[PDB]
Homo-oligomer: A and B are copies of this chain.
Amino acid sequence: TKKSREEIVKEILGRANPNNIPIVDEQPVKVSFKYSLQDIYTADVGTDQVELGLWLVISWKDRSLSWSNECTTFNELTLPSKYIWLPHIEVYNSIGKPGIHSDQLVRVYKDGTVTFVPQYTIRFSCALENVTTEQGAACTLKFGPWTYDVRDLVLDESQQVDLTTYAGGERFQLIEAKQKVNKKTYPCCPQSFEDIELRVTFKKI
């Protein structure tokens, strides 16, 4: 459509950079992570797995170069996620491969900021037992870079959990959704690793 926009895409995609961390100076890359819990689709007592429909908000800043003098033009362009590098964030205890609800498209900004929000259905281990009870049940899943240590990737969160999107007539009510950031160590490695633990406590309405 717009020629101005067209040059933007081409310049960044063609000339700008291959998979590599563009930032030479000592700076780790921080990725903000937010969860919007859309719905708790199902619970399996025998399996002890629960399914969550979530969208993950991920934001990071990449270094981009401005070759052509930027003029008032197309500020944000949308591109497929494949085009650019994305973070490794994954659920530590997912029973199965997560499925993707939405297309992989990411908006990029001139400053270099990128916003990618996938929609996912994830199955993770959690005992459903006592969902019916008033107390309800609690489940926790931790998300975080598999490979990256705290040094390489720093995870940050704005708030606890986004309930607002939550479906009004979901099978299960949400007593409370929390996303607490924590740093933890593994026997594999001396480096600290940061993950966000999403603890959802819910019960049947």
Closest to A43 in B: B190
Is the CB–CB distance between A118 and B152 below 8 Å?
no
Distance in Å: Cβ of A106 to nearest Cβ of chain B: 3
Q: How many residues of A contact B (CB 8 A)?
A: 203
Is the CB–CB distance between B31 and A122 below 8 Å?
no
- Give residues of chain A (26-80) contacting chain B, Cβ–Cβ below 8 Å: 26-80
Please report the C-alpha to C-alpha distance between residue A58 and residue B191 in the assembled complex, in whole angstroms.
14
Q: Which residues on the B side are within 8 Å of A91 (C-beta)?
A: 21, 29, 78, 85, 87-88, 101, 145, 147-148, 152-153, 190
Is the CB–CB distance between B81 and A167 below 8 Å?
no
Q: Which residues on the B side are within 8 Å of A136 (C-beta)?
A: 32, 57, 59, 113, 115, 158, 188
Distance in Å: Cβ of A104 to nearest Cβ of chain B: 2
Copies of this chain, count: 9
Please report the C-alpha to C-alpha distance between residue A56 and residue B58 in the assembled complex, in whole angstroms.
22
Is the CB–CB distance between B57 and A201 below 8 Å?
yes
Closest to A174 in B: B113
Is the CB–CB distance between A198 and B11 below 8 Å?
no
Over the window 117-154 of chain A, the binary record of Cβ atoms lying under 8 Å from chain B Cβ atoms (1 yes, 0 no) is: 11111111111111101111111111111111111111
Is the CB–CB distance between A16 and B24 below 8 Å?
yes
Is the CB–CB distance between A93 and B138 below 8 Å?
no
Q: Give the contacting residue for A85; candidates B42, B104, B138, B144; CB below 8 A.
A: B144
Over the window 92-105 of chain A, the binary record of Cβ atoms lying under 8 Å from chain B Cβ atoms (1 yes, 0 no) is: 11111111111111
Is the CB–CB distance between B98 and A29 below 8 Å?
yes
Is the CB–CB distance between A54 and B79 below 8 Å?
yes
- Give residues of chain A (165-188) contacting chain B, Cβ–Cβ below 8 Å: 165-188
Listed from nearest, the 7 A-B pairs whose CB atoms lie closest are A62-B163, A128-B190, A84-B161, A7-B101, A39-B110, A48-B192, A19-B89
Please report the C-alpha to C-alpha distance between residue A61 and residue B29 in the assembled complex, in whole angstroms.
20
Q: Which residues on the B side are within 8 Å of A44 (C-beta)?
A: 151, 190-192
